Write an enzyme that holds these catalytic residues in place. Sequence first.
Site, PDB file in Angstrom:
ATOM      1  N   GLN C  11       0.811  -1.219   0.000  1.00 18.72           N
ATOM      2  CA  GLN C  11       0.000   0.000   0.000  1.00 18.72           C
ATOM      3  C   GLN C  11       0.850   1.277   0.000  1.00 18.72           C
ATOM      4  O   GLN C  11       0.640   2.146  -0.842  1.00 18.72           O
ATOM      5  CB  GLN C  11      -0.990  -0.038   1.162  1.00 18.72           C
ATOM      6  CG  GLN C  11      -1.898   1.182   1.181  1.00 18.72           C
ATOM      7  CD  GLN C  11      -3.229   0.983   1.879  1.00 18.72           C
ATOM      8  OE1 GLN C  11      -3.435   0.136   2.735  1.00 18.72           O
ATOM      9  NE2 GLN C  11      -4.203   1.765   1.518  1.00 18.72           N
ATOM     10  N   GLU C  64      -3.010  -8.030  -2.128  1.00 23.95           N
ATOM     11  CA  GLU C  64      -4.457  -7.805  -2.103  1.00 23.95           C
ATOM     12  C   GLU C  64      -4.917  -6.797  -3.186  1.00 23.95           C
ATOM     13  O   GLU C  64      -4.108  -6.029  -3.714  1.00 23.95           O
ATOM     14  CB  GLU C  64      -4.876  -7.414  -0.679  1.00 23.95           C
ATOM     15  CG  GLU C  64      -4.360  -6.077  -0.138  1.00 23.95           C
ATOM     16  CD  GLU C  64      -5.375  -4.937  -0.041  1.00 23.95           C
ATOM     17  OE1 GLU C  64      -5.091  -3.879   0.574  1.00 23.95           O
ATOM     18  OE2 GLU C  64      -6.478  -5.084  -0.605  1.00 23.95           O
ATOM     19  N   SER C 133       7.045  -0.058   2.221  1.00 18.26           N
ATOM     20  CA  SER C 133       6.975   0.093   3.669  1.00 18.26           C
ATOM     21  C   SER C 133       7.834  -0.970   4.346  1.00 18.26           C
ATOM     22  O   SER C 133       7.727  -2.148   4.030  1.00 18.26           O
ATOM     23  CB  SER C 133       5.529  -0.080   4.118  1.00 18.26           C
ATOM     24  OG  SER C 133       5.395  -0.304   5.495  1.00 18.26           O
ATOM     25  N   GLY C 137       3.529  -6.362   5.668  1.00 26.26           N
ATOM     26  CA  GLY C 137       3.765  -7.746   5.289  1.00 26.26           C
ATOM     27  C   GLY C 137       4.173  -7.877   3.831  1.00 26.26           C
ATOM     28  O   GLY C 137       5.169  -8.536   3.545  1.00 26.26           O
ATOM     29  N   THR C 138       3.481  -7.208   2.903  1.00 25.90           N
ATOM     30  CA  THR C 138       3.892  -7.115   1.497  1.00 25.90           C
ATOM     31  C   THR C 138       5.131  -6.237   1.355  1.00 25.90           C
ATOM     32  O   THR C 138       6.114  -6.660   0.754  1.00 25.90           O
ATOM     33  CB  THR C 138       2.766  -6.589   0.605  1.00 25.90           C
ATOM     34  OG1 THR C 138       1.626  -7.382   0.776  1.00 25.90           O
ATOM     35  CG2 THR C 138       3.113  -6.586  -0.872  1.00 25.90           C
ATOM     36  N   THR C 172       1.421   2.172  13.291  1.00 33.38           N
ATOM     37  CA  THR C 172       0.096   1.746  12.806  1.00 33.38           C
ATOM     38  C   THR C 172      -0.197   0.274  13.092  1.00 33.38           C
ATOM     39  O   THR C 172      -1.294  -0.209  12.824  1.00 33.38           O
ATOM     40  CB  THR C 172      -0.036   1.984  11.301  1.00 33.38           C
ATOM     41  OG1 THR C 172       0.721   1.023  10.609  1.00 33.38           O
ATOM     42  CG2 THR C 172       0.401   3.359  10.837  1.00 33.38           C
ATOM     43  N   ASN C 199       7.349   8.624   8.783  1.00 35.44           N
ATOM     44  CA  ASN C 199       6.064   9.323   8.796  1.00 35.44           C
ATOM     45  C   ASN C 199       6.038  10.452   9.833  1.00 35.44           C
ATOM     46  O   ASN C 199       5.493  11.514   9.564  1.00 35.44           O
ATOM     47  CB  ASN C 199       4.906   8.352   9.081  1.00 35.44           C
ATOM     48  CG  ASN C 199       4.640   7.329   8.001  1.00 35.44           C
ATOM     49  OD1 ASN C 199       4.863   6.146   8.165  1.00 35.44           O
ATOM     50  ND2 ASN C 199       4.113   7.743   6.883  1.00 35.44           N
ATOM     51  N   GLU C 247      27.568   7.741 -10.304  1.00 34.81           N
ATOM     52  CA  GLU C 247      28.347   8.877  -9.825  1.00 34.81           C
ATOM     53  C   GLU C 247      27.869   9.330  -8.448  1.00 34.81           C
ATOM     54  O   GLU C 247      28.665   9.589  -7.556  1.00 34.81           O
ATOM     55  CB  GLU C 247      28.213  10.000 -10.855  1.00 34.81           C
ATOM     56  CG  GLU C 247      28.955  11.295 -10.570  1.00 34.81           C
ATOM     57  CD  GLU C 247      28.793  12.352 -11.678  1.00 34.81           C
ATOM     58  OE1 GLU C 247      28.231  12.063 -12.753  1.00 34.81           O
ATOM     59  OE2 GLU C 247      29.214  13.504 -11.448  1.00 34.81           O
TER      60      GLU C 247
HETATM   61  N1  LIG Z   1       3.646   8.158   3.847  1.00 36.42           N
HETATM   62  C1  LIG Z   1       2.840   7.117   3.749  1.00 36.42           C
HETATM   63  N2  LIG Z   1       2.966   6.125   4.602  1.00 36.42           N
HETATM   64  C2  LIG Z   1       2.063   5.091   4.377  1.00 36.42           C
HETATM   65  C3  LIG Z   1       1.154   5.117   3.365  1.00 36.42           C
HETATM   66  N3  LIG Z   1       0.391   3.969   3.397  1.00 36.42           N
HETATM   67  C4  LIG Z   1       0.867   3.273   4.417  1.00 36.42           C
HETATM   68  N4  LIG Z   1       1.912   3.913   5.046  1.00 36.42           N
HETATM   69  C5  LIG Z   1       2.727   3.359   6.115  1.00 36.42           C
HETATM   70  O1  LIG Z   1       2.770   1.940   5.958  1.00 36.42           O
HETATM   71  C6  LIG Z   1       3.239   1.361   7.189  1.00 36.42           C
HETATM   72  C7  LIG Z   1       2.702  -0.077   7.387  1.00 36.42           C
HETATM   73  O2  LIG Z   1       2.834  -0.829   6.180  1.00 36.42           O
HETATM   74  P1  LIG Z   1       1.478  -1.288   5.392  1.00 36.42           P
HETATM   75  O3  LIG Z   1       0.711  -0.066   4.913  1.00 36.42           O
HETATM   76  O4  LIG Z   1       0.599  -2.099   6.352  1.00 36.42           O
HETATM   77  O5  LIG Z   1       2.265  -2.036   4.239  1.00 36.42           O
HETATM   78  P2  LIG Z   1       1.590  -3.198   3.377  1.00 36.42           P
HETATM   79  O6  LIG Z   1       2.650  -3.611   2.365  1.00 36.42           O
HETATM   80  O7  LIG Z   1       0.369  -2.735   2.570  1.00 36.42           O
HETATM   81  O8  LIG Z   1       1.396  -4.344   4.445  1.00 36.42           O
HETATM   82  P3  LIG Z   1       0.423  -5.513   4.129  1.00 36.42           P
HETATM   83  O9  LIG Z   1      -1.034  -5.096   4.161  1.00 36.42           O
HETATM   84  O10 LIG Z   1       0.636  -6.521   5.225  1.00 36.42           O
HETATM   85  O11 LIG Z   1       0.655  -6.169   2.798  1.00 36.42           O
HETATM   86  C8  LIG Z   1       2.718   2.300   8.281  1.00 36.42           C
HETATM   87  O12 LIG Z   1       3.771   2.637   9.183  1.00 36.42           O
HETATM   88  C9  LIG Z   1       2.132   3.484   7.520  1.00 36.42           C
HETATM   89  O13 LIG Z   1       2.356   4.742   8.161  1.00 36.42           O
HETATM   90  C10 LIG Z   1       1.096   6.247   2.423  1.00 36.42           C
HETATM   91  O14 LIG Z   1       0.363   6.367   1.455  1.00 36.42           O
HETATM   92  N5  LIG Z   1       1.997   7.191   2.717  1.00 36.42           N
HETATM   93  N1  LIG Z   2      35.737  24.276 -15.436  1.00 39.42           N
HETATM   94  C1  LIG Z   2      34.826  23.354 -15.404  1.00 39.42           C
HETATM   95  N2  LIG Z   2      34.811  22.493 -14.396  1.00 39.42           N
HETATM   96  C2  LIG Z   2      33.795  21.583 -14.490  1.00 39.42           C
HETATM   97  C3  LIG Z   2      32.825  21.534 -15.464  1.00 39.42           C
HETATM   98  N3  LIG Z   2      31.941  20.485 -15.221  1.00 39.42           N
HETATM   99  C4  LIG Z   2      32.390  19.963 -14.114  1.00 39.42           C
HETATM  100  N4  LIG Z   2      33.511  20.571 -13.601  1.00 39.42           N
HETATM  101  C5  LIG Z   2      34.159  20.407 -12.270  1.00 39.42           C
HETATM  102  O1  LIG Z   2      35.299  19.553 -12.269  1.00 39.42           O
HETATM  103  C6  LIG Z   2      34.881  18.226 -11.968  1.00 39.42           C
HETATM  104  C7  LIG Z   2      34.850  17.460 -13.283  1.00 39.42           C
HETATM  105  O2  LIG Z   2      34.529  16.081 -13.176  1.00 39.42           O
HETATM  106  P1  LIG Z   2      33.689  15.352 -14.377  1.00 39.42           P
HETATM  107  O3  LIG Z   2      34.189  16.038 -15.642  1.00 39.42           O
HETATM  108  O4  LIG Z   2      32.236  15.576 -13.941  1.00 39.42           O
HETATM  109  O5  LIG Z   2      34.085  13.813 -14.221  1.00 39.42           O
HETATM  110  P2  LIG Z   2      33.908  12.893 -15.505  1.00 39.42           P
HETATM  111  O6  LIG Z   2      32.720  13.331 -16.325  1.00 39.42           O
HETATM  112  O7  LIG Z   2      33.713  11.501 -14.935  1.00 39.42           O
HETATM  113  O8  LIG Z   2      35.221  12.967 -16.206  1.00 39.42           O
HETATM  114  C8  LIG Z   2      33.501  18.316 -11.304  1.00 39.42           C
HETATM  115  O9  LIG Z   2      33.443  17.748 -10.018  1.00 39.42           O
HETATM  116  C9  LIG Z   2      33.246  19.822 -11.203  1.00 39.42           C
HETATM  117  O10 LIG Z   2      33.643  20.357  -9.949  1.00 39.42           O
HETATM  118  C10 LIG Z   2      32.847  22.528 -16.501  1.00 39.42           C
HETATM  119  O11 LIG Z   2      32.058  22.724 -17.421  1.00 39.42           O
HETATM  120  N5  LIG Z   2      33.908  23.391 -16.388  1.00 39.42           N
HETATM  121 MG   LIG Z   3      -0.554  -4.464   2.354  1.00 39.21          MG
END
Ligand SMILES: Nc1nc2c(ncn2[C@@H]2O[C@H](COP(=O)(O)OP(=O)(O)OP(=O)(O)O)[C@@H](O)[C@H]2O)c(=O)[nH]1
Ligand SMILES: Nc1nc2c(ncn2[C@@H]2O[C@H](COP(=O)(O)OP(=O)(O)O)[C@@H](O)[C@H]2O)c(=O)[nH]1
Ligand SMILES: [Mg+2]
Lengths: 426, 426, 430
Positions: C11, C64, C133, C137-138, C172, C199, C247
């Site tokens: 859920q 479910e 979650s 259970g799921t 809950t 939550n 990265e």
């Molecule tokens: N933020 C958020 N938390 C949710 C939501 N729905 C459920 N929860 C959280 O889900 C947790 C419990 O898990 P369940 O909702 O019972 O998970 P489930 O997988 O559906 O469990 P089963 O019914 O046994 O299959 C609780 O701590 C809730 O606060 C949602 O839409 N948003």
């Molecule tokens: N001067 C310059 N520095 C850059 C630029 N883009 C990224 N850098 C910086 O230098 C580093 C470059 O690493 P990056 O080129 O992203 O790694 P790679 O793509 O794996 O080779 C980054 O962590 C940035 O701080 C750019 O356009 N100009």
């Molecule tokens: Mg469930």
Amino acid sequence: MREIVHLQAGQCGNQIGAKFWEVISDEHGIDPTGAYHGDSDLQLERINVYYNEATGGKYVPRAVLVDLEPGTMDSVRSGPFGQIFRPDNFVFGQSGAGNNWAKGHYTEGAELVDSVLDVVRKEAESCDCLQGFQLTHSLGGGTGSGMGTLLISKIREEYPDRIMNTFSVVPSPKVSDTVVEPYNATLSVHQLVENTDETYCIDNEALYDICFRTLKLTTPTYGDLNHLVSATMSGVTTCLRFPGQLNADLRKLAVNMVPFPRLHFFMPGFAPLTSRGSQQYRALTVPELTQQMFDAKNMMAACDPRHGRYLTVAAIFRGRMSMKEVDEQMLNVQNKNSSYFVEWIPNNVKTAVCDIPPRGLKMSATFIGNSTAIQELFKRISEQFTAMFRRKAFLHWYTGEGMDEMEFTEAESNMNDLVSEYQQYQ
Amino acid sequence: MREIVHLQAGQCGNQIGAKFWEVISDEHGIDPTGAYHGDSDLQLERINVYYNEATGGKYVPRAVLVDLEPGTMDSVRSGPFGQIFRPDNFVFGQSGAGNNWAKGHYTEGAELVDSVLDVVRKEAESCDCLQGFQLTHSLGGGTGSGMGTLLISKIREEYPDRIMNTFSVVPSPKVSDTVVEPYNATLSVHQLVENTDETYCIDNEALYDICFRTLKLTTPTYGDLNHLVSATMSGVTTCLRFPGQLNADLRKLAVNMVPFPRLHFFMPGFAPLTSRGSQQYRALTVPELTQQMFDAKNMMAACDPRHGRYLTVAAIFRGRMSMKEVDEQMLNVQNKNSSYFVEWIPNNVKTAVCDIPPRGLKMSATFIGNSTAIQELFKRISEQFTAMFRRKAFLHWYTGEGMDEMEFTEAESNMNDLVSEYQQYQ
Amino acid sequence: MRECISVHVGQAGVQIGNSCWELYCLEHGLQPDGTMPSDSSFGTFFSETGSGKHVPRAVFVDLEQTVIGEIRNGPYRSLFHPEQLITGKEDAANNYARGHYTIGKELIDSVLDRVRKMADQCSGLQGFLVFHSFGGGTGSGFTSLLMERLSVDYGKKSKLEFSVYPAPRISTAVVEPYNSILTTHTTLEHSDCAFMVDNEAIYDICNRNLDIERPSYTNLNRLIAQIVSSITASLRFDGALNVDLTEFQTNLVPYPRIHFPLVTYSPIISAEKAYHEQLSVPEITNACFEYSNQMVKCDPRRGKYMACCLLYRGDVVPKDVNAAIAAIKTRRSIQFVDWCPTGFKVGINYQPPTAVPGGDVAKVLRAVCMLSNTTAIAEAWARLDHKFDLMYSKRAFVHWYVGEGMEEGEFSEAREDMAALEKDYEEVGT
Ligand SMILES: Nc1nc2c(ncn2[C@@H]2O[C@H](COP(=O)(O)OP(=O)(O)OP(=O)(O)O)[C@@H](O)[C@H]2O)c(=O)[nH]1
Ligand SMILES: Nc1nc2c(ncn2[C@@H]2O[C@H](COP(=O)(O)OP(=O)(O)O)[C@@H](O)[C@H]2O)c(=O)[nH]1
Ligand SMILES: [Mg+2]
Ligand SMILES: CC(=O)O[C@H]1C(=O)[C@@]2(C)[C@H]([C@H](OC(=O)c3ccccc3)[C@]3(O)C[C@H](OC(=O)[C@H](O)[C@@H](NC(=O)c4ccccc4)c4ccccc4)C(C)=C1C3(C)C)[C@]1(OC(C)=O)CO[C@@H]1C[C@@H]2O
Ligand SMILES: CC(=O)O[C@H]1C(=O)[C@@]2(C)[C@H]([C@H](OC(=O)c3ccccc3)[C@]3(O)C[C@H](OC(=O)[C@H](O)[C@@H](NC(=O)c4ccccc4)c4ccccc4)C(C)=C1C3(C)C)[C@]1(OC(C)=O)CO[C@@H]1C[C@@H]2O
Ligand SMILES: Nc1nc2c(ncn2[C@@H]2O[C@H](COP(=O)(O)OP(=O)(O)O)[C@@H](O)[C@H]2O)c(=O)[nH]1
């Protein structure tokens, strides 16, 4: 004047062909209607090499279009340039090849070849002096592999002294769409080694590697692959269509490129190729065209040339360029890379230079490799064939067309004989 | 004619690089399309140093663009000058470096380097006479630090006699965005001390100090930092792009700047820099360019030179100026500041003078310091590394890529060996 | 390229999902029927079909029917693919062993088949975003069944996990301590970065910053989704300093088992106050170090910081951020470990925080999400293992877990493994 007859077989051969006719019509300045609309007299001077003149100064290309299904003719005829071709030159069946070589060669295409060959006669008798046949096909599937090699056999028997020149898209393991691809290719390579004067081995794995690692295309289609193939098709005939500092006919290539009769399985490439967003930063010039052209990522077959040695390479350059600079770079390559060329040939590079570069670039180079590394293309097909054939898998579809099991044994035998002759000069 | 090959690695290297290509295209008068639109023949005379000529007189820059993620290529290709670069020269992976040196060097970039290096060959073979490699990267994160130093190692092994020249943005404590920054840099500096011929050490803390205490910018971006870096990149190559009263190639810098082989960790600067609202009150002239250039607030690394001594300084001036006045000021500085120069070298200043100042200023000076004060940049990284490494923190992300704990011990060992060699000449 | 598969379990995970997908649709401009009127920014979270319909890269799982039948009937009925909203017949009854051994044992091979059909539509999948979650259970038992499978099937891929965790006083269920402690093997062995949320801490944030006197769960889920939008923003958008999902981990996680960061967001603010506060980069940075804005009821001043990821979004400049973290380094009450002299990983992204139009949280030019590895979080574990100890000393509910196929020794083996994690977070502070 050195006319060529061009023939398209199956889906792939008609698709690389129907793109080729858009490329050489742009070069020769021919409109999709068949009317001439070009800039230059040089475009018109050799238009007879690929076209027939007809009434009103309309030009009709000397293609024969062959398929066992109507649907690729319908796709070509409705396409960007489809209205250019002669309606009589579309020769087709109704029921397809089923991706079966034996349907192509013995049943469905054996019926149709009598209707193909008598059109190849009408075009070859309209020629003033025919130099050769330029056939586009694939070695996977059944139409290009089995009917196209039937047609090579029939035209070879009828025209024994003319150049037979084939562009052959062929299987590889990581880019495959057919289960029986290894069978069809092994039955087809057995015909190419005996009959053709040149075969340009092309691979969809290498054509996708050019699209991702060079052009940086995000989603390359078959239309993008067909564009890479057709650039090298336009490339190798350039020297009978345009003037140059060094002219090379398809026969002047063959005499220099084929040391021993059967070693004619070439591997093409093209330059410049650039990432579409990067062109303004690149200098187009002979040593950059060279450093692309001779690099393993540019060639259109999966073979890395670093797994063999070249016998001969031909570099057919186009554009306004220095003969010192061309002759310098074609020396520098084979001296600095001397471990990758056979050392019983004293110069491994043929050069040619045309005065007319492709429309929209200042220079271009078409590369033709002959290399012992082409053993790897024939080896991996031969080992995929072997692993199915040891258990006779799928053979009822071929033996149902009246083919023998002995013909598979004899095809794979002739395949290992081709592998052994390239491995001999390693 | 002394071509350079330029290479961009990771986000920072591609960002300082993609700004550098906007700066030198303004100098050479090249349009964002790649077409030439400049005033002067001198702009065109050496355009080959950074560009390839292509058809229609379009110029294509000789950059290779390397990343392990598509998103920086997408940001460059869509950018102010993105359409200039060759589409084939964008070489990239899909899954990033994770800010991990070992992903760069052993896994994600070890896969990709075979596709990078074969493009570096196409550009270097297109050169008439290559002088060197100009690589932009950062030592923090994983792509620039770990793949860029893999690529330095591969190009160094292949081109042992050409200049390897790197621009290296590197960590400092008060301006940091990564937890593992000290690790990545210590593993990377270990490659730079052995392979590069010059490394220009640059710091975001010093680039922010120029923006607040000199330019008086209220909100300096990375785009403003990248503009300061790329001014000194344009600066040091000026003497192979334009004529001058004293010409200095990157090698003529290295012979004068590097006394003992490993002491090549330079520290750049630029003049004139003025508060945007104050320019009309300032006199642009050689002694004001000098009193800015040699002051501790102008240098682009956090090291105050008053914490060491210079070995060599190079002042590469640009503009119409007197050789007496340049030679007078470069004497007056090292005699009036004699406690800040090593006294076993009889003159510590190299000078060069180009006839062509940057577009929109009457004169300019690019400063290159070599100083024992660069010990402080390597020391503070080494002590941040040590405080994490004594408790093995974060090492499972690096040893997960198959890296040894012994390689960290050996990197920090080689770091203290670099600190000790600068502290020896103090 | 850059995909994420989001798996919403039980859920809590499904209802957080119903807020996540409410946000992502607004932020990418996708209608609740999946269409998009008029760049690939959506691609991380949505597959696109040829009709011009964007379908979410999400799986919703509950044992479910009730909560997912509401998703199948409300405004998002046309968004999701109908077979990736997955339901059983039988509730897991807040019993871990029904989720893991008895009831979830039947739905698991169908849940995996959807995740396979989503991963096969990715090209360089970045990771998994798993919402649940700890008390359910799921939530505990089915997530721990699923993660064990995904950690053999997709071993390289980063598994990010967003957990609603038991509070100091608010609860809950009676058996919430049992389900949470039995989950600690999942997070330790089969997760790569686990974001605990509480939550009771969000209820206090709502009271003090939004000035809503009496919030529902819709108010909590609209804060929990806003953090994941900010974690994913660098995957989805342009920025000055974009952060990759690995990265992020290379700067957050100092040691293999030390991957339980706190999270916080600033500014949490209502429309009554957002027009009178400055909300400068200095203020919203400093707000992340207040105990008042931590979304777990523990005090960061009773710990030491190992690493902080400050993930800014909207109108900010690296000048301002460096000038801000310089004041945080100056304050002696914010104490880092001796072995992390750098401390801060900075990310900066150009896309402002999207308002949900029905929501309490106001329009603002800037936000930061701070995700922070600190020794202080071990107190939220020390609270809950003291709730567990009172009940396990009596075996107070153990027959419901033993009755549904669990080994009785797993309770001791889970309290043991939690004591080894609570040891590890105390050991690295020194
Ligand atoms: N933020 C958020 N938390 C949710 C939501 N729905 C459920 N929860 C959280 O889900 C947790 C419990 O898990 P369940 O909702 O019972 O998970 P489930 O997988 O559906 O469990 P089963 O019914 O046994 O299959 C609780 O701590 C809730 O606060 C949602 O839409 N948003
Ligand atoms: N001067 C310059 N520095 C850059 C630029 N883009 C990224 N850098 C910086 O230098 C580093 C470059 O690493 P990056 O080129 O992203 O790694 P790679 O793509 O794996 O080779 C980054 O962590 C940035 O701080 C750019 O356009 N100009
Ligand atoms: Mg469930
Ligand atoms: C302003 C500018 O520089 O335009 C170029 C261009 O940007 C680039 C990227 C082009 C471009 O190529 C592609 O986009 C492409 C895509 C998939 C497969 C193959 C090519 C170009 O489209 C291709 C086009 O080339 C041609 O037109 C040739 O003459 C070519 N024929 C065709 O492509 C063609 C297209 C439509 C209809 C008929 C023909 C050719 C090649 C060999 C032999 C004969 C003709 C050119 C110069 C360009 C664009 C237009 C962007 C490139 O191609 C060529 C052949 O030059 C790809 O790498 C090169 C380098 C070029 O710089
Ligand atoms: C009327 C006037 O005096 O205009 C100046 C100006 O006001 C000042 C403040 C300029 C200005 O510089 C900046 O605003 C700036 C901001 C952040 C980081 C770096 C620079 C100027 O923008 C920068 C610009 O400089 C250039 O154009 C150089 O050629 C430079 N290239 C670029 O800046 C550039 C900009 C956009 C696109 C491509 C290039 C350069 C530097 C080194 C090597 C090659 C080229 C200049 C003279 C000015 C303005 C226009 C106000 C200054 O810069 C330079 C390089 O001269 C900053 O301090 C100097 C002193 C100048 O007086
Ligand atoms: N380059 C290219 N390859 C194609 C094209 N169409 C199909 N192919 C590929 O090459 C093989 C060609 O076989 P196909 O031409 O279909 O057999 P056929 O019609 O019986 O001769 C297919 O399996 C595809 O992988 C196309 O348009 N271009």
